């Protein structure tokens, strides 16, 4: 089992930028490396076979190089539709092994979250539970810090975030923190607050509401 080490692990590069991904073969694999594209939630697609040759129907802004046991995929002029995960593969021995993937996310101007908090529906609250939701809509960079204060005392591990893949039109990500707790503890506290920290905000925005059923 020859191991394809692959660097970097992900990159923000801007439209028009030249991009370079390397995969270093752990044994000489000769010229038998193919490179693949993975657009999110989709079958792998061949871009380059046996190091250098493009597949038919692959745009010439893509290209593959060999230099011993280091292999390079180059995108001359990164297009916004090359949001994908690229994979490299030695198909020299069995098993065919793959590299760990390189996510290539498009860079753009630091936007700021529109924060929104949502109280628990009482159809849920009936069922003895309470999911308080915080939305952070169309911001960039991806990083951000959501922070649950409940009557100011912020919480340990009881919230879980999920994040969008970046959009196709405007390269922004969205994200939600969901603080869930029993209808009992929920009702102990009065004020429910979310505190969003991001670069796009000079000051941390705090979204909140007073405990519902009112």
């Amino acid at each position: 089992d020859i191991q394809m080490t692959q660097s970097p692990s992900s990159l923000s590069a801007s439209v028009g930028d030249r991009v370079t991904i390397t995969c270093r073969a752990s044994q000489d694999v000769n010229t038998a490396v193919a490179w693949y594209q993975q657009k999110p939630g989709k079958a792998p697609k061949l871009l380059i076979y046996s190091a250098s040759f493009l597949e038919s129907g692959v745009p010439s802004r893509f290209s593959g190089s060999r230099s011993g046991t280091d292999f390079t995929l180059t995108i001359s002029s990164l297009q916004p539709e090359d949001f994908a995960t690229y994979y490299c593969q030695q198909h020299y021995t069995t098993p065919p092994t793959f590299g760990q993937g390189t996510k290539v996310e498009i860079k753009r101007t630091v936007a700021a979250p529109s924060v929104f908090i949502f109280p628990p529906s009482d159809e849920q609250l009936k069922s003895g539970t309470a999911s308080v939701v915080c939305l952070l809509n169309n911001f960039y960079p991806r990083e951000a810090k959501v922070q649950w204060k409940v009557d100011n005392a912020l919480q340990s591990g009881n919230s879980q975030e999920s994040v969008t893949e970046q959009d196709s039109k405007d390269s922004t990500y969205s994200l939600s923190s969901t603080l869930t707790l029993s209808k009992a503890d929920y009702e102990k506290h009065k004020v429910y607050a979310c505190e969003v920290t991001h670069q796009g905000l000079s000051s941390p925005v705090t979204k909140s509401f007073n405990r519902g059923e009112c």
Binding site: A32, A34, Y36, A43, P44, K45, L46, Y49, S50, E55, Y87, Q89, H91, T94, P95, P96, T97, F98, G99, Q100, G101, S114, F116, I117, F118, P119, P120, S121, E123, Q124, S127, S131, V133, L135, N137, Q160, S162, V163, T164, S174, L175, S176, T178, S208, F209, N210, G212, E213, C214
Partner: protein
């Protein structure tokens, strides 16, 4: 054109057995190798097994060797992967693909994949819960609303808004495995605050695993 479909994936209990299949069109599998590549959720691409349909020779990945059988039947043009004593580690999307051979041992055509989830856990469908506007402040400009899809097993669920007519500013997040072993997700939509009351927002939630189809009408409150 060279098409490769895959089928028969779903929830298996551990130690169970499944048979994924792969129906090749546009070419004769006879004169090609057929490969089963998998991908766990949020990890890379693992190769599991290959067949040369013509002399029937096989080769397996060690993780799999002995429990799994790749076979092919050339008269049906189909190739098959038999999974036995299925561990939770086998939960992955499974892709078959081919090696053209003529010029390259690259995997040029691939199928769409099929989700195989290996779990002890019984199918449960979504409880669908509104996430409603104006909970403290009524005025703003652009209001947001969503539906909270909670506690379903296995993946997927499909959230739509107003029977596919509200496609704008709709953000359905990645699902999250709860401490509970069950999933949750939110699907959200941004709209004008002028329209709240002039318009109904309804999300459509299809859990094809449990044969659930919930429609919730997300409408506003005051406190």
């Amino acid at each position: 054109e060279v098409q490769l479909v895959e089928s028969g994936g779903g929830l298996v209990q551990p130690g169970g057995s499944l048979r994924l299949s792969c129906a090749a069109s546009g070419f004769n599998i006879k004169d090609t190798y057929i490969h089963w590549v998998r991908q766990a959720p949020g990890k890379g691409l693992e190769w599991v097994a290959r067949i040369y349909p013509t002399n029937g020779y096989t080769r397996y990945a060690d993780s799999v060797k002995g429990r799994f059988t790749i076979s092919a039947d050339t008269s049906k043009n189909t190739a098959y992967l038999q999974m036995n004593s299925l561990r939770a580690e086998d939960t992955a999307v499974y892709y078959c693909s081919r090696w053209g051979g003529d010029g390259f041992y690259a995997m040029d055509y691939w199928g769409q994949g099929t989700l195989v989830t290996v779990s002890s856990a019984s199918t449960k469908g979504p409880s669908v819960f509104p996430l409603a506007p104006s909970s403290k402040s009524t005025s703003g400009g652009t209001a947001a609303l969503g539906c909270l899809v909670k506690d379903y097993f296995p993946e997927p669920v499909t959230v739509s808004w107003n029977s596919g007519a509200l496609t704008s500013g709709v953000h359905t997040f990645p699902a999250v495995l709860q401490s509970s072993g069950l999933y949750s997700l939110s699907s959200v939509v941004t709209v004008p605050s002028s329209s709240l009351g002039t318009q109904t927002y309804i999300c459509n939630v299809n859990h094809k695993p449990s044969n659930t189809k919930v429609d919730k009408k997300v409408e506003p409150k005051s406190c």
